[PDB]
Design a binder for this molecule. Structure first.
Ligand SMILES: NC(=O)c1ccc[n+]([C@H]2O[C@H](COP(=O)([O-])OP(=O)(O)OC[C@H]3O[C@@H](n4cnc5c(N)ncnc54)[C@H](O)[C@@H]3O)[C@@H](O)[C@H]2O)c1
Ligand SMILES: NC(=O)c1ccc[n+]([C@H]2O[C@H](COP(=O)([O-])OP(=O)(O)OC[C@H]3O[C@@H](n4cnc5c(N)ncnc54)[C@H](O)[C@@H]3O)[C@@H](O)[C@H]2O)c1
Ligand SMILES: NC(=O)c1ccc[n+]([C@H]2O[C@H](COP(=O)([O-])OP(=O)(O)OC[C@H]3O[C@@H](n4cnc5c(N)ncnc54)[C@H](O)[C@@H]3O)[C@@H](O)[C@H]2O)c1
Ligand SMILES: NC(=O)c1ccc[n+]([C@H]2O[C@H](COP(=O)([O-])OP(=O)(O)OC[C@H]3O[C@@H](n4cnc5c(N)ncnc54)[C@H](O)[C@@H]3O)[C@@H](O)[C@H]2O)c1
Lengths: 337, 337, 337, 337
């Protein structure tokens, strides 16, 4: 209805990609960025070159303390304290909280105190903060809610898949495994992970298949109450720049042939979930989804059925890119709604 | 009872590792090797240096056309036709068929025609050749069977896991996913796979999560009839030198707590299956099993249960090393039995 | 002057990229492709998806035995014998010989017998076949020469660098080292390289720094006679999808400051060699050049000088992309000249 | 003369490996370890499992706040302030300063204040702290010097190589390039490096060839005055667990054939520098030196000569393992001398 003004806290993989994903958009625009761990010179550099998604689609420069993207000026701050960021001065409608250390309503509030209208945590909340997944429950958003969560990359991939299958065949119970690409919280060589938590994530990322936990499957139950308590899963970190794959093993109430389930998913991908859920029958591999903007693409040939009620369903997702575009979709939605 | 004389056809990852794994052994010894794709000089080189398991634990040299391991002589041939290999002259009790292109009883017979007493296919058979898994059904071997199969690396990992769980809790149905390390049949850069079969395996192995199929789960039913038709699964090839991880999602007849299932497995690992099945509660990662000689090590902390009858069980395995030691165990067994 | 009709023999990394690089071009177009190791279905797949350069910028399909790129038809053959390819019927002005097994004038002749006007070997010749490097000696091409070589990726990178430095400061002698990205001739796991030649290239590409030889530096002397016998070097294969870096250590006749040499190169990159030689002072890394169409980009900050006559100069190059664009530049040139 | 008591500050790649390398030794033993970034439980874990060098050659456990290696007790501390570590109570003869943040005489002094007799910085000093390289100048050590530096992994590789070549042929000038394996100071995904220094090191380590600087070559001049000002070089970080390769391009005073230079090096490797400098003519690759305890192994076949005075010499080194063993050699030396 009118260009949404976005503010970004934490200019990392997600911060920068959300920024990159906004470039095309004509319904949203980033006007402010905050990150106390990079000078303006360092920030332009990081935004300009990317080891996964290529160089920035435009010229990046800075002048007088502003970030210059073509002929637009973006304010840049270096506040370690969110409450200290002049979001208000910049007329920020929504702040993309993507530092990964303010995942609670009390912590994410400081942005509102700084003048920001609303806030979106680019990760699962540690509080009972409302969680939303585009194309799944975003239409159940209440404008009075000023702080929300866009969930996790994995939840965004599994959620759509789960809804379609449950909606028609009904999911009795399911277990999920996601082979996930490398992430910023990992180490180059064997070392101690932060807070001595999840020791495995401190092991050399270059040569290991690394077991990790994830609440993505249980989170689905929060976005789809009908599924609360019917799903859970694990993760396996692998040495891949980007693109992860969800592997859902489920039991359905109503019997079906793999072909029928596949057909149902395809129908959703071309209809109501077009743009969120994708469908394919090609012999694809992770690299094929690098920079794919969908939340999840069903891989028909990769999955299979043991019998008429026990299935193994596979779906890919660019954990970085898809998620970043969704953050923008949610930002626009909760501002014009 | 008396040193088993082993012959190796196909001196590749498995051929060389079986050879390496025999070095310590005092009940078996390799006396002949055949591979028409490497001169003797090239063969010593490959056997001496290994990018995964380190250098050979002894000095490797050649003289007068023989392979010299210390002060032992090993005959070396370069026959493309198995029937042309003088196994008899070398008194070969068993031939480790590990070229991957003679996986049928008719094809593997040529070794018997060459003078070899018995043969073991280092891979699943394409015929109804008898399949054996150490510690699972090897005691059901019939001496009159001259050609057998040691199965696949994955089957050897999943089989023990399946038996213990089924034996006490009973497995109604199960689906499996194995994240597998890179393999010789893959390509360095995107290209056409052999015979235009399994296109995905021709995609760059360095940067892809590659979906692949596997009959390992169904094979379990062949080694454990009670499980025929109750298991199947898929694979995901990843960029790892060695070590794969089996991820079994199963439904049990009798309810149980994750702890009880874990306890049952541990009991087996320390008792009847000691040496085949391992157990651990440490925060491990793939690299931790490089060169582990067991067929499968249960990872207690990596798995979990959705409810009292739906479980996700994880077990690691060095696809190269463990399998190779098993080939030797089977070789000795079917020769002294 | 008029659209050049290109034929491609060997639809591999270079074949497909040359094809991809021609898509934009309005002065050249591919009308025929030959590769006996992929069915038409397999060929579309490989051309459509790429693990390095992304998906094809257009829809790829096939119908009635033709390759369909939008609404253009490209003939596709599967001849193992080059002389058997109907280049003439397709009016091929130039054939991009990129299979890597017909690098001699006698062998590359078969294309002329098939009806092709001229031929370009996408690699160094093993004969005294004429070698050309765009922007260096291509203007010394003789139209009566029907078979030529576009040289090697490394030569194309080093050649421009060498000319500029020699032209002004004069190179007395130089040694070069190129850290090269992985290549099709390498193996996923330790095995025997073809013909038992260059054993090192058969070692696991995923985890090794692999020493390899290269005539790229000596080749420079063939394209720049003034430098014959003044340069040579070695290579180091590393696990990188694409992008290699040339590292030239040279001694100049006339003294200079690193700044002056840098300035000279910059001058060439913005003047006479614009498009072939690039210049930069940014803190770049290999990934930054993925898909860069230049033959070599000088890295000012990466190099240095020991004294006024001994220098270490660094320059990057996308071994796949840049080279492929050059093949097109040469194809057009020798057809309209 | 009598078991040297070693203390380790910073239980990282080097800390743990020095500890691991001491296990066999009968002339030195670690009695204390300090690292405030890992609980005792976390420390045992990290010491027990290693993604590069395998599992610890003994059982690792902890009891009553001590590290238990078999039946030996090692005190463990978690002081962020070195001066606060009770080295004296533990009778520490030498402290292996390997945190990488106390590389100055003033900073490394705090250990002496804590009761430690002497100190060795496991890295190049930022002060004019004395630098020593085993087999090169360690016999010029003065017992009154309480703080010294064992130099850098690269210097330890290049130093021996340089001495032998200079001693007989004389090095006029030389430039060096080391392709180096990944290091702890690098990042898994593109991010900001510490202090905004060396931006390149913050780029994804998984997929980049990363240009880096190094004073290793100039440092050689400090250990070998005769070479001061005659050498310098650059580095290239690559995705390799461990093992780097030094590539020295040098000009000699006295002419020679590659064979003679190779012969000279071999002579040193088997004589005076045996154990420090290695020699080989095999087609080796980085993985072949994983866990090699030598400071540098000359690779005869990898190098070459342009003419009788201009050479390119290659030598490998396990940046982690060799260096760690050297730290122990120096520790014993300066305590019994
Ligand atoms: N990378 C993925 O695949 C992916 C996918 C979906 C969601 N996410 C995530 O989004 C979040 C961020 O992850 P990321 O990959 O972008 O990590 P990242 O480390 O690349 O980015 C985090 C940024 O936070 C900055 N920061 C730290 N403290 C700050 C402060 N006080 N104020 C402002 N900035 C601060 C850092 O300097 C950094 O640039 C995580 O919670 C994670 O769940 C990541
Ligand atoms: N690498 C693993 O992860 C793993 C684990 C368990 C089992 N296996 C396997 O065992 C088999 C062999 O695989 P690998 O990893 O050793 O592959 P590999 O490519 O390393 O070894 C195959 C060998 O076959 C040789 N060969 C080809 N044709 C021949 C012929 N006619 N006569 C004699 N030798 C011939 C080749 O030169 C090569 O040395 C496969 O079927 C596979 O299932 C592999
Ligand atoms: N990849 C690079 O970085 C790079 C850069 C510059 C030059 N080059 C090269 O150009 C050449 C090709 O290498 P590539 O990387 O494309 O390798 P590739 O293996 O990817 O492609 C070669 C193609 O040749 C085909 N082929 C084999 N025999 C054939 C025949 N008889 N007729 C028709 N096709 C046949 C194969 O099926 C394959 O598709 C090499 O000589 C190499 O020097 C490669
Ligand atoms: N990895 C190699 O290839 C190699 C080779 C030779 C030398 N070195 C080095 O030796 C040094 C250490 O590097 P590394 O690879 O072990 O890095 P690392 O990061 O693995 O280890 C450093 C340790 O310092 C600890 N630490 C931080 N602050 C501390 C404090 N105040 N007190 C005690 N401990 C503290 C960290 O927790 C960590 O365990 C570096 O300067 C580097 O040059 C590394």
């Amino acid at each position: 209805m009118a260009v949404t003004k976005l503010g970004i806290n934490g200019f990392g993989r997600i911060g920068r990609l959300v920024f990159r994903a906004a470039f095309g958009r004509k319904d949203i625009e980033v006007v402010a960025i905050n990150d106390p761990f990079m000078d303006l010179n360092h920030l332009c550099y990081l935004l300009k070159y990317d080891s996964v998604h290529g160089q920035f689609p435009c010229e990046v420069t800075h002048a007088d303390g502003f970030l210059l993207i073509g002929e637009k000026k973006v304010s840049v701050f270096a506040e370690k304290d969110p409450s200290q960021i002049p979001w208000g001065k910049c007329q920020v409608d929504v702040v993309c909280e993507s530092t990964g250390v303010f995942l609670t309503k009390e912590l994410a509030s400081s942005h509102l105190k700084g003048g920001a209208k609303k806030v979106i945590m680019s990760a699962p909340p540690k509080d009972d903060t409302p969680i939303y997944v585009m194309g799944i429950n975003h239409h159940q958003y209440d404008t009075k809610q000023l702080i929300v969560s866009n969930a996790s990359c994995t939840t965004n991939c599994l959620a759509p898949l789960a809804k379609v299958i449950n909606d028609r065949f009904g999911i009795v119970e399911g277990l999920m495994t996601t082979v996930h690409a490398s992430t910023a919280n990992q180490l180059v060589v064997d070392g101690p992970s932060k807070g001595g938590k999840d020791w495995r994530a401190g092991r050399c990322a270059l040569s290991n298949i690394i077991p990790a936990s994830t609440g993505a499957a249980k989170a689905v139950g929060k976005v789809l109450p009908e599924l609360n308590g019917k799903l859970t899963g694990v993760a396996f970190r692998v040495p891949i720049g980007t693109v992860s794959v969800v592997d859902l093993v489920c039991r359905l109430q109503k019997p079906a042939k793999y072909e029928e389930v596949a057909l149902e998913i395809k129908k959703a991908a071309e209809g109501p979930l077009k743009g969120i859920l994708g469908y394919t029958e090609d012999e694809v591999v992770s690299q094929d989804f690098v920079h794919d903007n969908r939340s999840s693409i069903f891989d028909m040939k990769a999955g299979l059925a043991l019998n008429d009620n026990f299935f193994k369903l596979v779906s890919w997702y660019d954990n970085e890119w898809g998620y970043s575009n969704r953050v923008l979709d949610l930002a626009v939605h909760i501002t014009n709604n």
